[PDB]
Amino acid sequence: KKYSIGLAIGTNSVGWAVITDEYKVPSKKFKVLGNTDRHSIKKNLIGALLFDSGETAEATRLKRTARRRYTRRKNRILYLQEIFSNEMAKVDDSFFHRLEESFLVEEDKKHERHPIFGNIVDEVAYHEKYPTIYHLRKKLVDSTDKADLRLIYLALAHMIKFRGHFLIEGDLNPDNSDVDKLFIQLVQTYNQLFEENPINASGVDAKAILSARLSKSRRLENLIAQLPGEKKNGLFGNLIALSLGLTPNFKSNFDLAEDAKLQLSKDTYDDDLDNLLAQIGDQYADLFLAAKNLSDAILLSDILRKAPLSASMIKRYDEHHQDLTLLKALVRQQLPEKYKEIFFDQSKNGYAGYIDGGASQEEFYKFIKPILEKMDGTEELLVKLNREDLLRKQRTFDNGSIPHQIHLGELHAILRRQEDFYPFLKDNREKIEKILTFRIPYYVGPLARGNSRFAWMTRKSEETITPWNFEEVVDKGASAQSFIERMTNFDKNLPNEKVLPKHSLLYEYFTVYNELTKVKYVTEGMRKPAFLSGEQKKAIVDLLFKTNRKVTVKQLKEDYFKKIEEFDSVEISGVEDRFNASLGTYHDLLKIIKDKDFLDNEENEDILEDIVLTLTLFEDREMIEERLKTYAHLFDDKVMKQLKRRRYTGWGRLSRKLINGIRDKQSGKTILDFLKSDGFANRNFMQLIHDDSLTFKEDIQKAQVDSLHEHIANLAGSPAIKKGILQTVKVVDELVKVMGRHKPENIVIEMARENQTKNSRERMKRIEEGIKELGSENTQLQNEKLYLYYLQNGRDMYVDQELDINRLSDYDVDAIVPQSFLKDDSIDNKVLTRSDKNRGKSDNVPSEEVVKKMKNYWRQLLNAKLITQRKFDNLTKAERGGLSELDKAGFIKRQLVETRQITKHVAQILDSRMNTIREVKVITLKSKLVSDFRKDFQFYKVREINNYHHAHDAYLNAVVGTALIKKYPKLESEFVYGDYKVYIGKATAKYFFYSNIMNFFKTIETNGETGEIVWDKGRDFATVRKVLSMPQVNIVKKTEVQTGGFSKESILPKRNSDKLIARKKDWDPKKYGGFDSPTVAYSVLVVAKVEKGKSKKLKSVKELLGITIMERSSFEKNPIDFLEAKGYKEVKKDLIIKLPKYSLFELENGRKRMLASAGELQKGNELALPSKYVNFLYLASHYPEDNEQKQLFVEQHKHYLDEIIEQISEFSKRVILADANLDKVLSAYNKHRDKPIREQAENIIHLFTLTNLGAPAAFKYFDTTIDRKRYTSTKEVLDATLIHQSITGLYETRIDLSQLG
């Protein structure tokens, strides 16, 4: 018999069904294993596998990094404590000890409870003189008096432990603090360079503008606005932006050919500036210096106002005191009835909650704001609140802007002050400072000893790596090299050959000749088009591609064919407007080394290939020098300086051994040789690789030498969908064994599209960058119309006119490619215009009329990067011919056939495992075909009822899939791999996919092309309806061992209960608090004896123990010792059953339960509603007129509202066993019986949350809501029937646990 298999792949489900020629679902008796009275059972060959989602590795990685950083932060302190160890023991012997015990309660604390000095008197005095750490810091920076070494350590430790960011490479100058004096100095040096066009900085408040709390882009706009006739994209405008921390491009300001982007924070700025000044002149040298100095002043004034930061923290502390003192007074005098709630009540978001409650600054401001407004004399207070500078703490969320240089400055100062009084401080100055400054390079990674699967570093020595001897022990080279070599692709054609750099000389030679060998030309003398020749190819490369970075068709026509070969009229094919491939690297090195004869000499191909490789591999200037030491004799000093800066990025798709190369046997030529000259053939790369006349094909296939899991894991795509793919393959494989190892006829796959789950800042940056290129709040950009308004510079996209910023609601949002052809609603296919009719045709790409008029305006937006390249091409698609009638057909075809790559991988895998010439055909459809089939023939789907619809979708897929391929034999739907046979009527093709493909279903007996019965409207319709009416479907919930975090991450306060988890072994929760809610990995059946106190006797028990994630490693190593440690003796090891989550149990009257944990159960049954009630619920919930009115009649005619309630009731009273809940359901039901059917049926659907398989959840009926009732007892399970299910659920082993007492 010939059977077919349908598949519905989701992120949490795999639907599957087996189907015969009559479109029916087979039945089979399956063997039942175990110790039960059941030996066989009848099951339909249809079902669904449900599972929890696959997770990404992101959360695991973030925590992995955080673990390393906590370890390394602690080490930094230890490094500092080591240096202080000797001299501290003389001053205080237990100081360091009191620090590492500070967390302990006074009882547990071995030493005296005062960490700093060890007595109450000195300790109180300290906090009295130094309320904050910044008071001490600022003190030690300025004062020249000998200070306590303990106070010196804590000041330095505080700097080390919280050292600030590393976003700014290099030092900053403390002297540059005056924003105005440096601004004027910046303007003056500008006017010195440009007397013809001076800048008046008379009435500009630079400090108020540049140090404003607004964005860099906003502050840039503010300052330029005060300057008449000055542009933001202007030279001075770009100088300000550089000073603000932005990255401007001076390429336009100096009419340069290449980019000249500068950023002061970047480590390569000094070289990029020297690169720029080399071209524009050293007359702008002290101009960028003046801009540099200004940025030093802007940076300081923003985050602070000899120890600027600490002093700024002190001022904040002082003003906090002032404003608090005033705040209490105004309350005592005006609102005394609110004083208790504000300053004593932690529960409220007042000052009390702000200090001791845990309320945030934002929550505190919102609460105290109306209070301030009600009172008077709060004018100076509310202005601070709106400026977010009212009653601020020192340690807050915005301290992240503080560079490490500033903490370093204070640290450096303190060490200098006490360098004389304390000896070892003078020697460890560079040493202590290094602890603060040292940052492990990203290209080095973890400093492992070969025990880390993430590490790649290689050491020079066996010594312990420290911040001081890092370069001595660590080989930066082999570490940085390995960093890139471990990620770079290998050639697919030559699996053992590493791929070439993207900017390789040979590579660009390849790309150019590959394109060049396929262009054609027609002159007046020839009647037929011809390929270029070897001599012609060599000339063009010599004269065009080596004399210009890019080559246009016009350049090919004029500069070559007309100028060199004396041809007036020439027409070029195989290339449009300009060549895609180019020789960029060649022109780069040409400008650098200034030796053309050296470059054109193929004798130095290996040399230049080695240079580009090292420039692509390494970024560090010091690493470049060591890798270019062999070429010191070839280039002068100035040449090497320009070559070290030239660093490339990116890697190609082909290896060197492949391109030039393996030689063909007879010809002796490499692939590149063929691309240079191939007589009349001019075969391109794809033709050479597949040519059986050549030996490239054989050499490649002989070069190619993996588990299914690993292959799937390596595929791109979400781990959620990849998980479903693996289970799909297992379902199919088991189904084959079910069908006696016989392959199916067809496999029809339907894969659901996944869901769409900082953005305003991303959108705001693309606007600011676009406006500045045109010379024209963040949360507001959420709206599509407003966002497009700025994207279109307040102008129409179809008409040359300005749009009103108010009547946005009165204007239209249009789609470039009509919604009928493509299902795209993104901004890449969206346009804000005044009218729909201004686009021209309503069934096509915007007319050539509006294209010819708006082409320029669009290009301006394109060059301003306000619109995508793709969006541009779609806007002007009518210029190239517009949407063809075949294109219209293609868009309809691609609505039925899946296009996604990840789906093609599933089809490819199943095609490789089934066909071993082609026995099985793999078909991949979209959900549209089945969905329309359900809507057309009233096979309505209601997901909230049960999970059967997953199996239904799979069933309907195989039906529609195999019937369409039988009725109309075409293979644009069936998957083919590597066996592609390269080889009007579109009006019919468009009409074909538009209707006729589903029409042969509509109505009597449809036949195939050669007398083959395909669809019988008399019987096959009832067959499908019968299938969807089957009460038995194999629904399997994939049982899984829970992994991940030990518990919830929230550390709870101390409590008297013993439910809390200890954060450390010695930290009892009663005194220190801890975690709650431990996560259970899996449960274990335990049949043993337990001591029944206090008789010291034994009583045999049968219990369910939950093995938590934390305990799992301990348990699995030695379970019997583990169980004995918890009070379980006389343990029957043979009765230890592993019970992961979702383990299935059957009880009385067929009710099933699944394990959610060792103490909670879930509902294990499905409510199989008849199809009649299903269609009624769909229609009544959704409320051609001649066709829609008739369906409204049956809706009105039927009284099913009372019958569905009876269905749920019978199910609930039998299986759900929720007495109190169900009674509230029935009472609230008839309560709203007066409400219309649409309002009734829509709430009836909500009621199925009561009967849904899985975890109990709350559901509401109108205004009446119902709390969820979960099963908090697992005692029932112990005397029930455990059911081990295979992935399909067809093969099951059931264990009667009642015989294990």
Added chain:
RNA sequence: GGAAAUUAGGUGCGCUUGGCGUUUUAGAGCUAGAAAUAGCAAGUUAAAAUAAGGCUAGUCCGUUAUCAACUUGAAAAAGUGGCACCGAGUCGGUGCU
């Protein structure tokens, strides 16, 4: 179906790094009462931990993927369950071997 180039967007994997949060303790609360309770004073900071912990002791590892049961394999993983027919409230019945 697949490959290369050109433009761009987007997603992931890995590394390096900053700032919060949380938890315990330190920062002597005072006065009036026999005490529960009132009147006030005060609050901004720090230490330490930040999965338990582990060994190979590294400035390393510690939350992804994968997992029914029963037989096998170092492993990857591979093996193990008779077929039609008639019905349908979760699968049942009848018949063949």
Added chain:
DNA sequence: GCCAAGCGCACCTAATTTCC
């Protein structure tokens, strides 16, 4: 439990040119 910065590599999507 959250927010933020930087670097590299790989992949997918989406139109053009040339091919298998």
